[PDB]
Design a protein around this ligand. Structure first.
Ligand SMILES: C[C@@H]1CC[C@@]2(OC1)O[C@H]1C[C@H]3[C@@H]4CC=C5C[C@@H](OCCC(CO)CO)CC[C@]5(C)[C@H]4CC[C@]3(C)[C@H]1[C@@H]2C
Ligand SMILES: C[C@@H]1CC[C@@]2(OC1)O[C@H]1C[C@H]3[C@@H]4CC=C5C[C@@H](OCCC(CO)CO)CC[C@]5(C)[C@H]4CC[C@]3(C)[C@H]1[C@@H]2C
Ligand SMILES: C[C@@H]1CC[C@@]2(OC1)O[C@H]1C[C@H]3[C@@H]4CC=C5C[C@@H](OCCC(CO)CO)CC[C@]5(C)[C@H]4CC[C@]3(C)[C@H]1[C@@H]2C
Ligand SMILES: C[C@@H]1CC[C@@]2(OC1)O[C@H]1C[C@H]3[C@@H]4CC=C5C[C@@H](OCCC(CO)CO)CC[C@]5(C)[C@H]4CC[C@]3(C)[C@H]1[C@@H]2C
Ligand SMILES: C[C@@H]1CC[C@@]2(OC1)O[C@H]1C[C@H]3[C@@H]4CC=C5C[C@@H](OCCC(CO)CO)CC[C@]5(C)[C@H]4CC[C@]3(C)[C@H]1[C@@H]2C
Ligand SMILES: C[C@@H]1CC[C@@]2(OC1)O[C@H]1C[C@H]3[C@@H]4CC=C5C[C@@H](OCCC(CO)CO)CC[C@]5(C)[C@H]4CC[C@]3(C)[C@H]1[C@@H]2C
Ligand SMILES: C[C@@H]1CC[C@@]2(OC1)O[C@H]1C[C@H]3[C@@H]4CC=C5C[C@@H](OCCC(CO)CO)CC[C@]5(C)[C@H]4CC[C@]3(C)[C@H]1[C@@H]2C
Ligand SMILES: C[C@@H]1CC[C@@]2(OC1)O[C@H]1C[C@H]3[C@@H]4CC=C5C[C@@H](OCCC(CO)CO)CC[C@]5(C)[C@H]4CC[C@]3(C)[C@H]1[C@@H]2C
Ligand SMILES: C[C@@H]1CC[C@@]2(OC1)O[C@H]1C[C@H]3[C@@H]4CC=C5C[C@@H](OCCC(CO)CO)CC[C@]5(C)[C@H]4CC[C@]3(C)[C@H]1[C@@H]2C
Ligand SMILES: C[C@@H]1CC[C@@]2(OC1)O[C@H]1C[C@H]3[C@@H]4CC=C5C[C@@H](OCCC(CO)CO)CC[C@]5(C)[C@H]4CC[C@]3(C)[C@H]1[C@@H]2C
Ligand SMILES: C[C@@H]1CC[C@@]2(OC1)O[C@H]1C[C@H]3[C@@H]4CC=C5C[C@@H](OCCC(CO)CO)CC[C@]5(C)[C@H]4CC[C@]3(C)[C@H]1[C@@H]2C
Ligand SMILES: C[C@@H]1CC[C@@]2(OC1)O[C@H]1C[C@H]3[C@@H]4CC=C5C[C@@H](OCCC(CO)CO)CC[C@]5(C)[C@H]4CC[C@]3(C)[C@H]1[C@@H]2C
Ligand SMILES: C[C@@H]1CC[C@@]2(OC1)O[C@H]1C[C@H]3[C@@H]4CC=C5C[C@@H](OCCC(CO)CO)CC[C@]5(C)[C@H]4CC[C@]3(C)[C@H]1[C@@H]2C
Ligand SMILES: C[C@@H]1CC[C@@]2(OC1)O[C@H]1C[C@H]3[C@@H]4CC=C5C[C@@H](OCCC(CO)CO)CC[C@]5(C)[C@H]4CC[C@]3(C)[C@H]1[C@@H]2C
Ligand SMILES: CN(Cc1cnc2nc(N)nc(N)c2n1)c1ccc(C(=O)N[C@@H](CCC(=O)O)C(=O)O)cc1
Ligand SMILES: Nc1ncnc2c1ncn2[C@@H]1O[C@H](COP(=O)(O)OP(=O)(O)NP(=O)(O)O)[C@@H](O)[C@H]1O
Ligand SMILES: CCCCCCCCCCCCCCCC(=O)O
Ligand SMILES: [Mg+2]
Length: 1197
């Protein structure tokens, strides 16, 4: 196979340290990874194996439920399948919990040694060394073993996901027709896409369901044994932290919902602006959409700011939660009359930190993921119990005959429907005869196709279909694979028959067309073909695959007569000599190749007659931030962050200093306790309370400020983007697909509004916490700086060596995930022919291969992530060992408080470091959206809407426009389309100027509607067109598009978005233009909210309302962008009467392919190669004596 998984031959040490992954990274560092550089899935992880095992378990569960007469449970089957393999990992989770719980005990033993320091006690030093050895043993167990266990847990989750997908596909291939109608293909694709990924997550935290509450209990016990009932107080706060935060989360969700609605609305308008941007710029309607989007964005940014404030409050609350817990518990401790010591204080601090992280991060996450997985299992289960075809029976004996007969069959697509689709049909088919049903679609040719017991199971009829069915559908379908596979469809390669189809079936054209040849791989979803090829290849599969019964829904209609005649002589008469030839047709040639004709209506068979009857630079970050706020604000922000972290560390430093001062104090004030230098509770307690209050306040302020500045940056960037895009040239929209721009406006902006601020704030917070831990350790033991310089350096290199590969693997997993869904989708389009060919196992194997490839991707992703995690935690464990033992080596220059503080922070460095590195990677990956946003933010814009000119009103005094040696450039650096066009429009005249091409007539538009870029001297109103701004130029030009599109919003906004017409004006304007009978009946009257792009208005009414807007607009000219021809005839007679008296107020120029629309026009601009050779009236031109007019009259018609 491919390079076999080294995990098979990997020994225990290599598997724990992921040593076997080393070669891959090497190649991952040498070049770019592909699918060939991949590792095959393990034999026990193959999709077929897991699918079969879960099939057995689920079938057993179904049988048990049926025996005991209750609804079967999928959760029961999943548990009964994976519980043995999961409880062992729960064993390891017990071990991990025990190590995490008992590490602070040995921390307290070392600190107690420091508390009772005696330089002459060697035995105490040896005991402390042994305690440090046990502590580092525990942290290595925690470091390299939680990661091996985590990889196994994630592998279990991936196994569950793969088995579930195999289950779903196996069910889908056996789904029913009416069930297919009940459930859409989108629902099933969604099941494979987002509803099954939850199983990849729940398994991560499932064991915590019993690990969290238990560990918590244990911690409480230990805490009691240290400080008694006071510990409970701290625990109480932790408990309070569980509901309240969850409660706020609920509120969070609510706010999110509201924002969603606004976003959708905005996005809708976004689509409506980008798809019809040409029209928006054509009509000079930019102000209306601009203000509408401004209002929508303002509301959205208000709701997003509220949600961001809530999330920032949550982050600040968790950041300061440890201090609140410690402050409460130790204030209770001191106020009860006790005296604090470094050992007990820092044991309590470490235990509280561990238990708080567990209880407040893993347990609620475990509950949330379990609930999501439960609802997903419920949905997937109700799909697996979705009614399947009432059991599709293996076909009845194909005993050499072709005896089929239908006698008063009343069974349809939906049995409950009383309206007959097919019945009356009562005939008998004999072996070898050729039949061919021909006639109108009717209501049952599909039933004759499905007469293979597809969807017409006989309620009263009885059809003995014998033989092998070759079904061809209305829409031919081509599956994912190689052209050999689609032609072959499981059949063995037969060269001569393949040649036979290439000659008789005339596929040599396709051989020529394919870019690779006879080895050409069918593209994804089989696109490397055309409709003729898919229909022909369906018939080709049937005839090559030498089936017996051939059901063809008009495949010879699509193909040409040559191939059709070839298959009658060669195939239908000779090769398909003893095959069923059900062929619907409408030409006269397959009508005359047939022997029997079937014509159908609702049910009753009328007759049976015969014939004669990579990274983002500092510029990106700088522009994002300076887009956020003034650099003074950023100086204030970094000062606030530093103050917050300083207060966070100093709250514990105050406890440590109390301990250090307390150590000197124990020496004189405790042992020599007669003087009773009682600690001034007011003084000491006040500084402690002030420090913790300052920590809380500074954390809250920093979180709020970061969120506010980032959200403000997002809002300014979005506003700038809309303003910039609104001024984008039509060239940008022509070059860039609509989907690309819509995606840039939707996904990146959603990122910048939701994910980027939160991730950036979390990364900054965690990085500051890590820096605080490192600085505490360095401050306590300065020599710790010496080994820290190499370690960090190594980390940097390591990071690169991972990322350079990691991104690639991630990219690979993205490109390997969409094929699976497409194959499922492919199965859904052609399920009929899949069941027709009895090819369920082949499609199952193809889906299994697609899933196995994606399983390779997912396995690589999990394993590489664990490799990096193992090395990072090894670095952190090395740091903890270094701190604890360098503390032990000297000890002379250190006291209990400093050692306790430093060790507790080293004991917390691990999780924080993991969070910070992964979050930094996430931020760096997500900043590509910011890069794209800045790219759109600075695209080239056109001339300003108003320049300086500003003509006096009543401007279109003359309406005279001329062109004077213009050399047209359609696109900069493109072809030449107009060279010295010299038209003449008189003053104060109901006369117009029109060109023809989307760029020649747009040249006219550049002169007035402003959409192309003519070079030549242009005289509008005896003033050059150039000096007039965009809108001040766009204002006096009325126009009708090829497709008079309609925009979502009120009816009032569509008729007049600028509100320049008084109400009785719209009333009498629509009655004069006769739309009033249509609009009076509209429920919204004038302010009717239109449907999706004006669905209710007819196309005749859409052109009518655009001409009507122009009429209220009261311009003197109007351009019909080749629209006098694509006019509905009531409108044609109408528009003739219009330019006689109704558009009398607007000038129409009729350029068209409908000659009747142009004979009436006063002037015709004849153009060859896009050039005006002759310019005079049509009447001289229309007769025979004329050059080009006579050519269009002759040849063009
Ligand atoms: C995960 C597990 C949790 C429980 C547990 O294991 C790991 O935690 C360990 C702590 C250990 C003690 C630590 C300190 C010393 C001092 C040392 O001093 C020798 C002095 C001599 C020089 O050799 C003369 O100077 C003798 C041994 C002793 C008492 C350990 C005994 C075993 C203990 C109890 C272990 C216990 C089974
Ligand atoms: C509700 C939450 C879940 C359960 C739990 O947390 C809170 O509820 C707490 C009750 C605590 C015990 C109450 C009283 C004492 C007596 C004391 O002094 C006398 C000693 C002498 C008595 O016979 C000889 O042992 C020693 C400690 C002990 C046993 C407590 C231990 C911790 C315990 C089990 C805590 C436990 C983890
Ligand atoms: C959900 C709940 C939130 C918080 C809470 O429980 C859980 O946290 C507990 C802490 C308790 C105090 C701890 C110790 C004592 C002992 C005794 O005073 C010493 C007497 C004598 C002994 O030798 C001289 O030392 C009297 C009672 C007192 C003050 C407790 C009162 C109730 C308190 C405040 C509890 C409070 C309701
Ligand atoms: C965990 C949650 C956060 C809020 C809270 O619990 C829930 O946190 C607890 C702190 C408790 C106080 C701690 C200490 C004392 C001193 C004692 O005085 C006799 C001392 C004696 C020897 O020192 C003679 O001097 C009387 C009781 C009192 C005031 C407690 C009252 C209840 C308080 C306020 C609790 C409060 C409701
Ligand atoms: C602290 C004590 C020790 C531990 C423990 O007890 C208390 O903590 C509890 C957490 C409980 C689960 C939390 C959430 C759910 C989801 C729900 O599914 C959605 C259904 C809904 C969707 O809309 C309605 O349809 C099903 C129940 C389940 C899995 C709980 C199971 C029992 C559990 C494991 C309990 C466990 C024994
Ligand atoms: C990012 C920033 C880099 C620099 C910096 O912050 C973070 O690093 C901090 C460390 C601080 C010192 C720590 C300990 C002491 C000892 C004591 O000196 C004798 C006192 C004696 C005679 O007065 C008493 O009897 C007090 C002062 C001193 C030197 C601190 C000074 C400020 C310093 C330099 C801070 C400085 C602004
Ligand atoms: C981004 C953040 C900006 C600020 C910050 O981090 C990064 O900068 C660090 C400065 C550190 C203190 C410097 C000096 C000491 C003295 C030491 O004792 C000396 C005794 C001596 C006798 O020989 C040596 O042995 C005890 C600790 C303490 C107070 C430090 C605590 C942590 C502090 C506050 C850190 C603080 C959080
Ligand atoms: C921008 C940042 C704002 C905060 C901050 O930096 C800059 O401001 C600094 C002030 C520092 C303290 C100055 C003096 C002392 C006294 C010393 O006690 C000697 C006892 C005895 C020995 O002989 C005397 O004779 C212990 C250390 C301590 C408390 C410093 C702690 C760290 C502090 C709080 C620093 C803190 C990180
Ligand atoms: C940002 C935060 C604000 C500032 C702050 O944290 C950071 O900085 C810390 C430094 C601490 C002081 C260090 C050393 C001394 C020793 C001794 O000095 C007696 C001198 C007096 C009598 O002889 C002369 O008249 C008494 C205690 C004192 C002043 C500490 C008190 C608490 C202080 C001010 C802490 C305070 C909360
Ligand atoms: C940052 C925010 C501002 C408010 C605040 O946090 C949040 O700031 C904290 C500082 C605390 C005070 C510090 C020092 C003392 C002196 C002591 O006695 C002195 C006697 C003698 C010297 O020995 C005088 O010369 C009495 C208590 C008192 C006033 C504290 C009270 C509580 C206070 C006000 C805290 C308060 C909650
Ligand atoms: C972070 C939170 C906000 C700020 C704050 O709380 C915590 O940080 C503390 C800094 C403290 C002062 C620093 C240095 C000393 C000198 C020393 O000795 C000289 C005084 C002498 C007479 O001149 C007699 O001691 C002790 C007193 C004093 C002035 C502190 C007072 C309390 C203050 C103002 C606290 C303040 C409210
Ligand atoms: C984000 C950054 C992480 C790293 C870092 O900043 C923040 O963390 C700070 C901790 C600082 C030390 C704290 C305490 C002291 C004691 C003092 O005692 C002199 C007494 C006498 C004998 O020399 C004077 O004559 C000497 C200096 C020293 C060791 C600091 C050095 C600078 C350090 C390492 C800082 C370092 C750049
Ligand atoms: C790149 C890294 C930056 C940090 C660091 O490494 C390199 O820079 C080093 C400088 C060292 C100090 C130098 C001088 C002295 C004087 C001495 O007083 C007795 C003097 C007597 C006997 O030496 C003369 O003969 C006490 C110790 C002290 C303060 C050192 C402490 C450790 C320090 C801070 C080291 C620290 C780990
Ligand atoms: C804690 C763990 C320690 C080991 C380890 O993980 C962490 O550290 C990682 C760093 C990786 C190396 C980075 C760069 C090079 C480049 C090139 O050699 C240049 C040679 C030239 C440079 O100066 C002269 O020597 C070839 C590859 C090599 C050596 C990488 C190999 C794999 C290494 C050793 C990884 C290894 C698994
Ligand atoms: C300490 N910390 C910081 C942090 C940041 N934001 C938070 N936000 C909230 N709401 N709650 C928290 N507890 C929290 N914690 C952590 C710790 C662990 C993980 C964690 O769940 N998992 C692994 C990786 C697993 C994963 O989440 O994908 C890690 O990187 O530490 C996340 C954040
Ligand atoms: N999915 C379906 N659900 C219900 N009824 C259906 C379905 N598909 C087809 N029908 C029935 O069949 C009718 C369509 O005519 P059909 O028998 O498919 O003609 P045809 O095969 O399209 N003929 P031609 O186009 O000339 O090859 C429908 O109007 C229904 O009566
Ligand atoms: C304490 C953890 C810090 C993590 C922050 C990331 C620091 C990365 C510094 C190097 C950036 C990348 C250098 C070029 C290589 C690349 O293309 O990624
Ligand atoms: Mg049909």
């Amino acid at each position: 196979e491919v390079k076999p998984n080294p995990l098979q031959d990997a020994n225990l040490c290599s598997r724990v340290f992921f040593w076997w992954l080393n070669p891959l990274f090497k190649i991952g560092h040498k070049r770019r990874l592909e699918e060939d550089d991949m590792y095959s899935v393990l034999p026990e992880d193959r999709s077929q194996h897991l699918g079969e095992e879960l099939q057995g378990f689920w079938d057993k569960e179904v049988l048990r439920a049926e025996n005991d007469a209750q609804k079967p449970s999928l959760t029961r089957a999943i548990i009964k399948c994976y519980w043995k393999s999961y409880l062992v990992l729960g064993i390891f989770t017990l071990i991990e919990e025990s190590a995490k719980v008992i590490q602070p005990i040995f921390l307290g033993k070392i600190i107690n040694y420091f508390e009772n320091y005696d330089p002459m006690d060697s035995v105490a030093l040896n005991t402390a060394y042994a305690y440090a050895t046990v502590l580092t043993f525990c942290t290595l167990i925690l470091a390299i073993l939680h990661h091996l266990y985590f990889y196994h847990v994630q592998c279990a989750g991936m196994r569950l996901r793969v088995a579930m997908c195999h289950m779903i596909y196996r069910k889908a291939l056996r789904l029913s027709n009416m069930a297919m109608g009940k459930t859409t293909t989108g629902q099933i694709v969604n099941l494979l896409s987002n509803d099954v990924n939850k199983f990849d997550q729940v398994t991560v935290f499932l064991h915590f369901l019993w690990a969290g509450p238990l560990q918590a209990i244990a911690v409480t016990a230990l805490l009691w044994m240290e400080i008694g009932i006071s510990c409970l107080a701290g625990m109480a706060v932790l408990i309070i932290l569980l509901p309240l935060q969850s409660c706020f989360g609920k509120l969070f969700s609510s706010l999110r919902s509201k924002t969603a609605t606004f976003t959708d609305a905005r996005i809708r308008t976004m689509n409506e602006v980008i798809t019809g941007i040409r029209i928006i710029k054509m009509y000079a309607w930019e102000k209306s959409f601009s203000n509408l989007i401004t209002n929508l964005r303002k509301k959205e940014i208000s709701k997003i700011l509220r949600s961001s404030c809530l999330r920032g409050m949550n982050l600040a609350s968790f950041f300061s939660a440890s201090k609140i817990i410690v402050f409460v518990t130790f204030t209770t401790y001191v106020l009860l009359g006790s005296v604090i010591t470094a050992s007990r204080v820092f044991v309590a601090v470490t235990l509280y930190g561990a238990v708080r992280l567990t209880v407040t991060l893993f347990f609620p996450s475990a509950i949330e993921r379990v609930s999501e997985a439960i609802v997903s299992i419920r949905r997937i289960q109700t799909f697996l119990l979705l009614d399947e075809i009432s059991q599709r029976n293996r076909q009845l004996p194909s005993d050499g005959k072709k005896m089929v007969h239908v006698q008063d069959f009343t069974a349809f697509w939906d049995k409950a429907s009383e309206t007959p689709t097919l019945q009356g049909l009562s005939f008998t088919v004999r072996p070898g005869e050729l039949l061919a049903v021909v006639g109108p679609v009717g209501a049952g040719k599909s039933s004759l196709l499905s007469a293979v017991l597809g969807e017409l199971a006989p309620s009263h009829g009885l059809v003995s279909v014998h033989g092998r069915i070759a079904y061809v559908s209305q829409q031919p379908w081509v599956f994912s694979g190689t052209l050999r596979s689609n032609i072959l469809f499981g059949k063995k390669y037969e060269k001569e028959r393949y040649e036979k189809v290439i000659k008789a079936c005339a596929l040599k054209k396709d051989l020529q067309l394919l870019e690779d040849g006879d080895l050409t791989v069918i593209g994804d979803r089989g696109t490397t073909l055309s409709g003729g090829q898919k229909a022909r290849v369906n018939l080709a599969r049937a005839v090559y695959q030498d089936a017996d019964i051939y059901l063809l829904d008009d495949p010879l209609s699509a193909v040409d007569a040559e191939v059709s005649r070839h298959l009658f002589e060669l195939c239908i008469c000779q090769i398909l000599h003893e095959k069923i030839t059900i062929l619907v047709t409408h030409q006269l040639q397959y009508l005359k190749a047939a022997s029997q004709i079937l014509i159908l209506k609702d049910g009753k068979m009328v007759q049976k007659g015969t014939y004669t009857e990579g990274k983002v630079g500092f510029q990106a970050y700088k522009n994002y931030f300076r887009a956020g706020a003034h650099w003074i604000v950023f100086i204030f922000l970094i000062l606030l962050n530093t103050a917050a972290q300083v207060a966070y560390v100093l709250q514990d430093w105050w406890l440590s200093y109390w301990a250090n001062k307390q150590s000197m104090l124990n020496v004189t004030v405790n042992g020599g306790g007669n003087v009773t230098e009682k600690l001034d509770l007011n003084w000491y307690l006040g500084i402690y309370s002030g420090l913790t209050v300052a920590t809380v306040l500074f954390g809250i302020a920093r979180s709020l400020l970061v969120f506010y500045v980032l959200v403000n940056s997002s809002q300014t960037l979005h506003n700038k983007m809309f303003e910039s895009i609104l001024k984008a040239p039509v060239l940008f929209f022509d070059r860039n697909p609509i989907g690309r721009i819509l995606n840039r406006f939707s996904k990146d902006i959603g990122h910048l509004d939701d994910l980027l601020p939160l991730t950036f704030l979390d990364f900054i917070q965690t990085l500051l916490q890590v820096v605080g831990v490192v600085s505490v350790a360095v401050a306590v033991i300065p020599w710790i700086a010496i080994p820290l310089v190499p370690l960090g350096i190594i980390f940097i290199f390591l990071r690169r060596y991972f990322l350079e590969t990691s991104r690639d693997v991630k990219r690979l997993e993205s490109t390997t995930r969409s094929p699976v869904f497409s194959h499922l989708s492919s199965s859904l389009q052609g399920l009929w022919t899949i069941r027709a060919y009895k090819a369920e196992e082949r499609c199952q194997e193809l889906f299994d291969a697609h899933q196995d490839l994606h399983s390779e991707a997912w396995f690589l992703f999990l394993t590489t992530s664990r490799w990096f995690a193992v090395r990072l935690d090894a670095i952190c464990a090395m740091f903890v060992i270094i701190v604890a033992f360098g503390s032990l080596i000297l000890a002379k220059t250190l006291d209990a408080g400093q050692v306790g503080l430093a060790l507790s922070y080293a004991l917390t460095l691990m999780g924080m470091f993991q969070w910070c590195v992964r979050q930094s990677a996430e931020v760096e990956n997500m900043m590509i959206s910011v890069e794209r946003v800045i790219e759109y933010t600075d695209l080239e814009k056109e001339a300003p809407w108003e320049y300086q000119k500003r003509p006096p009103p009543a401007w279109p005094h003359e309406g005279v426009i001329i062109f004077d040696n213009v050399n047209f450039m359609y696109s900069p650096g493109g072809p030449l389309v107009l060279k010295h066009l010299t038209a003449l429009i008189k003053s104060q005249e109901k006369v117009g100027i029109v060109g023809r091409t989307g760029a020649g007539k747009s040249s006219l538009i550049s002169a007035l509607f402003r959409l192309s870029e003519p070079e030549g001297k242009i005289w509008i109103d005896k003033i050059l067109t150039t000096e007039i701004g965009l809108h001040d130029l766009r204002k006096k030009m009325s126009i009708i598009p090829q497709e008079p599109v309609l925009f979502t919003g009120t009816m009032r906004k569509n008729l007049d978005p600028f509100n320049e017409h008084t109400d009785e004006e719209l009333w009498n304007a629509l009655q004069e233009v006769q739309l009033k009978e249509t609009i009076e009946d509209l429920p919204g009257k004038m302010d009717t909210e239109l449907a999706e792009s004006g669905s209710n208005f007819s196309v005749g009414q859409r052109q009518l309302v655009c001409l009507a807007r122009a009429i209220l607009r009261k311009n003197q000219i109007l351009i019909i962008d080749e629209a006098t021809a694509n006019v509905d005839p009531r409108t044609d007679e109408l528009i003739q009467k219009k330019i006689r008296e109704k558009f009398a107020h607007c000038t129409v120029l009729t350029i068209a392919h409908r000659l009747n629309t142009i004979i009436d026009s006063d002037k015709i601009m004849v153009l060859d190669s896009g050039r005006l050779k002759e310019y005079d009236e049509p009447y001289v031109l229309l007769q025979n004596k004329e050059s080009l007019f006579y050519k269009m009259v002759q040849q063009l018609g």
